[PDB]
Amino acid sequence: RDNIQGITKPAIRRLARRGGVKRISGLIYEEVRAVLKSFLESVIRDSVTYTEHAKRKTVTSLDVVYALKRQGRTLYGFGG
Amino acid sequence: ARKETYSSYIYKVLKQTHPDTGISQKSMSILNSFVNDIFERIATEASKLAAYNKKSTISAREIQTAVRLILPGELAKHAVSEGTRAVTKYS
Amino acid sequence: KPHRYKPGTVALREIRRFQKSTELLIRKLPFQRLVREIAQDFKTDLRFQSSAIGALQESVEAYLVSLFEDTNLAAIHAKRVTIQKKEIKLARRLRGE
Amino acid sequence: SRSAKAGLTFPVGRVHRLLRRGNYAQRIGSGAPVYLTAVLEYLAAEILELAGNAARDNKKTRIIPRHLQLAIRNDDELNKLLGNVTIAQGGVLPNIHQNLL
DNA sequence: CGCCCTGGAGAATCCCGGTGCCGAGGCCGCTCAATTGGTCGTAGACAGCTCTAGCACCGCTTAAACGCACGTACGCGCTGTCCCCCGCGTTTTAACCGCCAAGGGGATTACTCCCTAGTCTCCAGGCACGTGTCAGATATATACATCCTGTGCA
DNA sequence: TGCACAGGATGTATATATCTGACACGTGCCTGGAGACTAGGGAGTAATCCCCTTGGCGGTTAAAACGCGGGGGACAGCGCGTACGTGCGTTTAAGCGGTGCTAGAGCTGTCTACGACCAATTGAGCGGCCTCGGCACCGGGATTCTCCAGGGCG
């Protein structure tokens, strides 16, 4: 039940500090939350597709990396 | 079980360039992902280029032109230079 | 006399502090229950390895920072210091989304 | 091996057999794996020397992912080569806007 | 004295015929890879067994999140300014044809050898793995080293 | 009585033995290296034909180029206030040390469907062709649609 609220407002403020933002408005914390909600669906969906094709009940790192491979992001590091 | 990586080769080239500074394991995995990715890059481009010429054979020509078109003029220029030097010296 | 900084001073030192740190800015448990929440309505009774979670969180953080940079530049194009809801849509749709 | 007589490092046999089992074409030439090992060795040497000097700037004898990150981002040919690549534990560049000063 | 609302005017648009024009499709001639069957040998699914990290959990241990109070300063609304590009008329050039007819080289099709490598084969060796050893970080004797206390004195 | 001192009772950096982590070196079984046979795929040539140029006069048209008016819209100046920036104390909950499991991840024989490889037919699909009904462009006319001048109204 409603785990999307798990991201704290100071966390979005710190992510804004990483991007070089000085002053932040109110609706930024909602908009960034929604964009994350869509992104996690757009990835996790393909991650479940590959897992279902591989006949596995557990999601591995190769599933995530190969899931971000076809989208052009090509996540390096873990599961390379 | 067994696995294959570029570790020893990256360490040898490291000794050929700067035989002092070491390499962390994670950065070594990043280099493994880089070489493994470029391998599929040049190989796939050589496959499509071989398909455009209606030929079933992939030679050093396809790799030369492919490397030329998929890389900037500097990296393709030096890559074709040293590559043709190594191949011509080999044969 | 209390010692208080003028507004806008702590933001700079916060930028200096966080831009020098490679640590993850999101806690593990909320992202865990969030990923599991997204995975509930797709395939019931799944399992997540100890890995691949830091890859999702790492790509989310690294991508969202770049999104905050492009959105920041979009806010600079409007000649102000404040990021607005329309800036995220501008810098979002203008990237091909 | 034929890599030593040609002045190479990476093995030619692994790349040749990998291209054979890679389902690319029916016929494979004998100069293609040597050429590919030459290009890959050149690029790998470039990344190793650039990340090496990047480690020399921070006065560290080991290469952290941040040194490779700044080494790739600071070069124009490497940034244009891979613009979509996400490096883990590499951080970002110290980019500070002038109007915010 | 000067501004919303109305009315006259003008032109840009929509839609419906009305006839010349050309390539979509049909039709045929033709012709070549799909289809059918046989052979053959070969990797994939079925267990089989195993083993190992994910799972669910419990309890210190701090540490960010949060609620709020103050605040001050920039986003915003408003106003005056002025200048720059649109609308239109007049000037200036790009491109088509007529004259007046010729070739030209480069991809295409067909033919023709010839030799580099797939395939098979055996011999060897090399890097993933196990172990040795020092570097760095850790936890503890220790020889003084600074208050506290008897403690004797002038 | 007020005072200096000789020694114990605690700290504290200082020096020494001790605990992970990562580099460094010594192996042997699935890899590569290499030798010989087959052969069809690649390098080379002989017409070829076919659309693509060569060079420049003129006459004329539609498109490009310039020139000015000014109207409205970009843009500088400036005051406001509430919306976040900044600073405290108080809470919930992740980090992390440690634990008992298991159920799914992961390497290995069997054979058996079952698809890879190869002759024979042909018919459905591709090169060639030649028409006409849908399409291209514009007049006729109605319709809407915006532009400008009072004037009744402030």
Swiss-Prot record, chain A:
It is found in: Nucleus; Chromosome. Changing residue 69 to E: Mimics glutarylation; delays in cell proliferation; increased sensitivity to DNA damaging agents. The keyword Ligase does not apply. The modification N6-acetyllysine is found at residue 57. The modification N6-succinyllysine is found at residues 9, 55. Its main location: nucleus. It comes from the Eukaryota. GO terms for cellular component: nucleosome; nucleus; RNA polymerase I upstream activating factor complex. GO terms for biological process: chromatin organization; nucleolar large rRNA transcription by RNA polymerase I; nucleosome assembly; positive regulation of transcription by RNA polymerase I; regulation of DNA-templated transcription. The modification N6-glutaryllysine is found at residue 69. Keywords: Acetylation, Chromosome, DNA-binding, Methylation, Nucleosome core, Nucleus, Phosphoprotein. The modification Phosphoserine is found at residues 38, 42. Glutarylation at Lys-69 (H4K91glu) destabilizes nucleosomes by promoting dissociation of the H2A-H2B dimers from nucleosomes. The modification Omega-N-methylarginine is found at residue 33. One of its GO terms (molecular function) is structural constituent of chromatin. The nucleosome is a histone octamer containing two molecules each of H2A, H2B, H3 and H4 assembled in one H3-H4 heterotetramer and two H2A-H2B heterodimers. The octamer wraps approximately 147 bp of DNA. Histone H4 is a component of the UAF (upstream activation factor) complex which consists of UAF30, RRN5, RRN9, RRN10, and histones H3 and H4. Present with 524000 molecules/cell in log phase SD medium. Belongs to the histone H4 family. This is Histone H4. It comes from Saccharomyces cerevisiae (strain ATCC 204508 / S288c).
Swiss-Prot record, chain B:
Its main location: nucleus. The modification N6-succinyllysine is found at residue 12. It is found in: Nucleus; Chromosome. GO terms for molecular function: DNA binding; protein heterodimerization activity; structural constituent of chromatin. Keywords: Acetylation, Chromosome, DNA-binding, Isopeptide bond, Methylation, Nucleosome core, Nucleus, Phosphoprotein, Ubl conjugation. Monoubiquitinated by the RAD6/UBC2-BRE1 complex to form H2BK123ub1. H2BK123ub1 gives a specific tag for epigenetic transcriptional activation and is also prerequisite for H3K4me and H3K79me formation. H2BK123ub1 also modulates the formation of double-strand breaks during meiosis and is a prerequisite for DNA-damage checkpoint activation. Deubiquitination is performed by UBP8 in presence of SGF11. Phosphorylated by STE20 to form H2BS10ph during progression through meiotic prophase. May be correlated with chromosome condensation. H2BS10ph is also formed after H(2)O(2) treatment, and is a step leading to apoptosis. GO terms for biological process: chromatin organization; negative regulation of transcription by RNA polymerase II; postreplication repair; regulation of DNA-templated transcription. The modification N6,N6-dimethyllysine is found at residue 3. Belongs to the histone H2B family. This is Histone H2B.1. The chain holds residues 36 to 126 of 131 of the full protein.
Swiss-Prot record, chain C:
GO terms for biological process: aerobic respiration; chromatin organization; global genome nucleotide-excision repair; intracellular copper ion homeostasis; nucleolar large rRNA transcription by RNA polymerase I; positive regulation of transcription by RNA polymerase I; regulation of DNA-templated transcription; rRNA transcription. The modification N6,N6-dimethyllysine is found at residue 43. Its main location: nucleus. The modification N6-propionyllysine is found at residue 20. Phosphorylated by IPL1 to form H3S10ph in a cell cycle-dependent manner during mitosis and meiosis. H3S10ph is also formed by SNF1, promotes subsequent H3K14ac formation by GCN5, and is required for transcriptional activation through TBP recruitment to the promoters. Dephosphorylation is performed by GLC7. Mono-, di- and trimethylated by the COMPASS complex to form H3K4me1/2/3. H3K4me activates gene expression by regulating transcription elongation and plays a role in telomere length maintenance. H3K4me enrichment correlates with transcription levels, and occurs in a 5' to 3' gradient with H3K4me3 enrichment at the 5'-end of genes, shifting to H3K4me2 and then H3K4me1. Methylated by SET2 to form H3K36me. H3K36me represses gene expression. Methylated by DOT1 to form H3K79me. H3K79me is required for association of SIR proteins with telomeric regions and for telomeric silencing. The modification N6-methyllysine is found at residues 1, 43. The modification N6-acetyllysine is found at residues 1, 20, 28. It is found in: Nucleus; Chromosome. The modification N6-malonyllysine is found at residue 20. One of its GO terms (molecular function) is DNA binding. The modification N6,N6,N6-trimethyllysine is found at residue 43. The modification N6-succinyllysine is found at residue 43.
Curated annotation (Swiss-Prot), chain D:
Its main location: nucleus. The keyword Acetylation applies. The keyword Acetylation applies. GO terms for cellular component: nucleosome; nucleus. GO terms for molecular function: DNA binding; protein heterodimerization activity; structural constituent of chromatin. The modification N5-methylglutamine is found at residue 89. Core component of nucleosome which plays a central role in DNA double strand break (DSB) repair. Nucleosomes wrap and compact DNA into chromatin, limiting DNA accessibility to the cellular machineries which require DNA as a template. Histones thereby play a central role in transcription regulation, DNA repair, DNA replication and chromosomal stability. DNA accessibility is regulated via a complex set of post-translational modifications of histones, also called histone code, and nucleosome remodeling. Belongs to the histone H2A family. The [ST]-Q motif constitutes a recognition sequence for kinases from the PI3/PI4-kinase family. In contrast to vertebrates and insects, its C-terminus is not monoubiquitinated. This is Histone H2A.1. It comes from Saccharomyces cerevisiae (strain ATCC 204508 / S288c). The gene is HTA1. The chain holds residues 18 to 118 of 132 of the full protein.
